[PDB]
């Protein structure tokens, strides 16, 4: 009933494994070299749990490790265990573990334990009672009494925090393996292994494609492959090339490109907004690298957009400076000030009503996030005066950033005009031409010194003053 036929997935059919594959072949060793494991006085760990984002191929990983193990494979949905009546689920898991026991050697797979692995006492109902009964039955089948060494369970959950502490107790679910989002090389391998089944060209550098689809799951890479199969009848070309995959990545990243009737002043307004955004984005190190700048309307966003990719390591670790945030608010204050510099204060539009709210939210978050230097951070107080004064600093930072944005914008009026003319004329601008116009019409942008230069100057100053103390002690003593 719960048995499958025709399992042939191996480690070659799955891509982007890394050192996890090593752990995977450990399971193969657990299924092959087990006599040496047992002779060294070691109990076989029967519980492995794969945790990660959905779409990483948890079922594919289970199929691959089952095929490489060379044993019978069981894959069962956990939603079948939950029933409006109580009792059938415990019998189902008992019969499941029994047929797994008699089919030894074998490996079983149970996906989405979050339906049946919830805490006992979070919902008051008969369904919760059935869930508790099934959880206890699987608890007693896994470790409860002696008599199982050859059946190994495989678990695949997206939220490991809902797991019962009874299950993760040593002896039931001890091995925990995280399968993360693919980085760079995993995306190459997944795209290539999904693209073997389609005729493909030899000039196809997937590096740029994966450099566009940063931080996307393997199922999304399969989708990118899927938007590289049909759509070529409109032009009718010969072979799949780089630009087709680049456009497919652009489509799956933002949406379908649609053209509608429009006036000229609307295009001028949108291009002025995008021009302000890009011009202020140029003058800061936090978002200097600009790739695309367009004003074409898309699905869900009539307004234009800009693309920037600074290294994604500081955001994950949280090492962003205060100057990194105070600039960004200025960037989010780029559109409205441009309106004040182009149409007057009496004719402010309502297109920047979203970025201006982002600027004020970022200012409030920076104020109450400990980055403020009013007393020393201290985003919490007791008396009413200091709590009232907390919000005033957000307004002061907002006004300072708005004035800085206004000054920066007034510094670059010629670059403003040239890039806005190019935006209304071409509707899309790449990195090369935009940076060429920035070089032709830009002003001075003195970059503030980084951490290394400040460290070096402070180190030489410290050494010189400590050696000054050295002579002022020595020649005074000698």
């Amino acid at each position: 009933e719960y048995l499958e036929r025709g399992v042939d997935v191996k480690f070659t059919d799955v891509a982007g494994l890394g050192k996890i594959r090593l752990e995977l072949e450990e399971i193969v060793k657990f299924f092959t070299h087990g006599e040496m494991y047992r002779r060294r006085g070691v109990k076989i760990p029967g519980g492995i749990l794969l945790c990660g984002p959905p779409g990483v191929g948890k079922t594919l990983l289970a199929k691959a490790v089952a095929g490489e193990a060379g044993v019978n494979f069981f894959s069962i949905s956990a939603s079948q265990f939950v029933e409006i009546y109580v009792g059938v689920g415990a019998s189902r898991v008992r019969a499941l573990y029994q047929e797994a026991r008699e089919n030894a050697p074998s490996v079983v797979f149970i996906d989405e334990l979050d339906a049946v692995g919830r805490e006992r006492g979070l919902i008051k109902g008969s369904g919760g009672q059935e869930r508790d009964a099934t959880l206890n039955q699987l608890l007693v089948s896994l470790d409860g009494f002696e008599g199982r060494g050859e059946v190994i369970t495989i678990a695949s959950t997206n939220r490991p925090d809902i797991l019962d502490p009874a299950l993760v107790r040593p002896g039931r679910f001890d091995r925990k393996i995280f399968i993360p989002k693919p980085g760079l090389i995993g995306r190459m391998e997944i795209l290539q292994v999904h693209a073997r089944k389609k005729p493909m060209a030899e000039d196809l550098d997937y590096m740029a494609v994966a450099s566009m689809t940063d931080g996307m799951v393997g199922a999304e890479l399969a989708n990118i492959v899927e938007i590289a199969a049909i759509n070529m009848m409109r032009d009718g070309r010969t072979e799949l090339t780089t630009d087709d995959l680049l456009q497919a990545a652009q489509i799956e990243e933002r949406g379908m490109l649609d053209r509608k009737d429009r006036s000229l002043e609307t295009w001028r307004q949108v291009a002025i907004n995008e021009a302000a955004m890009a011009v202020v984005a140029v003058n800061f190190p936090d978002m200097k690298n600009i790739e695309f700048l367009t004003i074409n309307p898309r699905a869900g966003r009539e307004l234009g957009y800009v693309r920037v990719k600074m290294d994604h390591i500081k955001f994950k670790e949280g090492m962003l400076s205060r100057q990194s945030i105070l600039d960004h608010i200025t960037v989010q204050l780029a559109p409205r000030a441009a309106d004040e510099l182009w149409y007057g204060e009496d004719q402010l539009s309502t297109i920047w009503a979203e970025t201006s709210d982002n600027a004020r939210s970022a200012a409030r978050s920076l104020v109450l996030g400990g980055l403020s230097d009013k007393h020393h951070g201290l985003n919490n107080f007791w008396v009413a005066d200091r709590i009232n004064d907390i919000d005033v600093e957000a307004l002061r930072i907002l006004n300072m950033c708005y004035e800085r944005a206004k000054e920066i914008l007034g510094r670059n009026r010629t670059l403003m005009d040239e890039v806005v003319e190019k935006l209304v004329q071409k509707k899309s601008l790449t990195k090369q031409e935009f940076f060429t116009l920035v070089e032709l019409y830009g002003s001075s942008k003195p970059m503030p010194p980084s951490i290394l230069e400040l460290r070096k100057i402070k180190r030489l100053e410290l050494e010189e003053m400590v050696l000054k103390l050295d002579m002022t002690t020595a020649r005074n003593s000698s």
């Binding site: 199922a219 309502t350 004020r360 709590i387 005033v392």
Partner: protein, 441 residues
């Protein structure tokens, strides 16, 4: 919008078998019948290849497990069977599956994953040209008079689906049958339009003269303020088509407003919003300049919207330039609708775009309240000063609308042309009949 009609068109153009079935037909009392029906339908489609399967109202089966009987278990089992069947499809077998839905939010995201629903096509309501074509198609089936101009009704009915246009044509044919007309006249079209929009007219259900002159004063003042703002400062506002005070449906009075093009509904500038605020305050301005200091409740409703709109000027949009730190949600929410004032100039009036934050400092709140009161009082004073300079035209329009029970925008424009500013009231009061108009449209 004819999603089922579109699927039937695809099946007819392809010349392939078409298996249409509703999702609610898969939901029964006995558990497992729906999964068996799913399997049988997929098997029958696989027998007659190529084929098109169509499931209407798939949200009945694919309802999300919301965290806000055995029917839920049966629905889950049928959805799992559908997922298994869709995942097991080989692409080269030539069977195309279509699922129609009205609420994409209720759908299970598992179905939205690649491999089950690869293409997601949004069937938007038809445009003016599309509504014109749909009206032509539906009027090809019924005897039509040459005086009916379908382009005007296509342009004047935004957001109308093809089914609604078909119902409009059928109701007009029914009206023509009731009026014993040999063909659908333009009057039948107008009657059907008014029946669908504002409802049918009642039979002599009228209140006293006191409670009617007030509604007349409000509607005529709003229309006069809008027309004057169009005439003098060339405001980018709407136009008053017609005003009625006959009860229709659940509304005792109405002002039909012609909807402008959508390209002017995005870049709402400060003068346009201030002029619309003046239009909203024009009703209470008319009550103040006509009925002195004894106003009524019939002008408070507009007084509500203006009292909210200025707030959206100062907090949500941040149009003035002392910058604010947080917005506020609307305490009262009113749906955009028919003959009541537009309040959809930026798509909607009572819909904050998730730009609200809870406050910490309470002094900025009273500063914002003071600024809003100042702006509201200034705009109210401005519209009262504008309306008080034209009293003969306003009173003449009030009397004409009170006599005829209906008036048109061109009649209001003619009243404004025949009554220049600063005319004395004795010119109107010396006429033989104030509620008479010598213009024949």
């Amino acid at each position: 919008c004819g999603k089922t009609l579109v699927a039937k068109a695809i099946a007819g153009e392809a010349g392939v078998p078409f298996y249409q079935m509703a999702g609610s037909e898969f939901v029964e009392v006995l558990v497992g019948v729906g999964s068996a029906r799913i399997r049988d339908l997929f098997k029958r489609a696989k027998v007659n290849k190529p084929s098109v399967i169509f499931i209407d109202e798939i949200d009945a089966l694919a309802t999300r497990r919301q965290g806000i009987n055995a029917a839920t278990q049966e629905r889950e089992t049928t959805l799992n069977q559908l997922l298994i069947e869709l995942d097991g499809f080989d692409t080269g077998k030539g069977v195309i599956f279509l699922g129609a839905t009205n609420r994409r939010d209720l759908l299970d995201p598992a179905l939205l994953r690649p491999g089950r629903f690869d293409r997601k096509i949004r069937v938007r309501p038809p445009n003016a040209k599309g509504r014109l074509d749909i009206l032509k198609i539906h009027a090809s089936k019924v005897k039509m008079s040459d005086s009916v101009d379908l382009s005007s009704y296509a342009s004047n009915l935004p957001g109308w689906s093809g089914a609604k246009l078909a119902q409009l044509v059928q109701e007009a044919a029914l009206v023509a049958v009731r009026k014993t007309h040999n063909s659908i006249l333009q009057s039948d079209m107008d009657d059907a339009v008014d029946r669908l929009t504002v409802g049918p007219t009642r039979i002599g259900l009228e209140l006293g003269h006191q409670g009617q002159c007030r509604r007349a004063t409000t509607e005529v003042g709003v229309a006069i303020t809008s027309h004057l703002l169009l005439r003098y400062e060339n405001a980018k506002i709407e136009r008053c088509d017609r005003v009625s005070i006959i009860p229709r449906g659940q509304t005792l009075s109405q002002v039909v407003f012609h909807r402008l093009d959508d390209e002017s509904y995005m870049f709402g500038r400060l003068p346009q919003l201030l002029h619309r605020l003046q239009v909203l305050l024009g009703g209470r301005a008319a009550e103040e300049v006509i009925y002195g200091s004894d106003t009524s409740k019939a002008s408070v409703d507009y007084l509500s919207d203006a009292s909210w709109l200025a707030r959206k000027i100062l907090t949500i949009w941040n149009l003035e330039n002392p910058m604010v730190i947080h917005g506020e949600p609307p305490p009262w929410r009113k749906r955009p609708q028919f003959v009541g004032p537009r309040l959809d100039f930026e798509g909607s009036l009572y819909d904050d775009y998730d730009l609200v934050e809870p406050p910490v400092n309470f002094n900025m709140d009273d500063e914002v309240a003071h600024r809003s009161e100042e702006l509201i009082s200034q705009m109210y004073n401005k519209t009262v000063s504008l309306l008080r300079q034209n009293q003969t035209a306003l009173l003449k329009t009030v009397k004409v609308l009170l006599n005829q029970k209906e008036i048109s925008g061109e009649a209001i424009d003619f009243i404004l042309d025949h009554y220049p500013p600063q005319t004395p009231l004795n010119s109107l009061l010396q006429e033989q009949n104030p509620g008479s108009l010598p213009f024949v449209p």
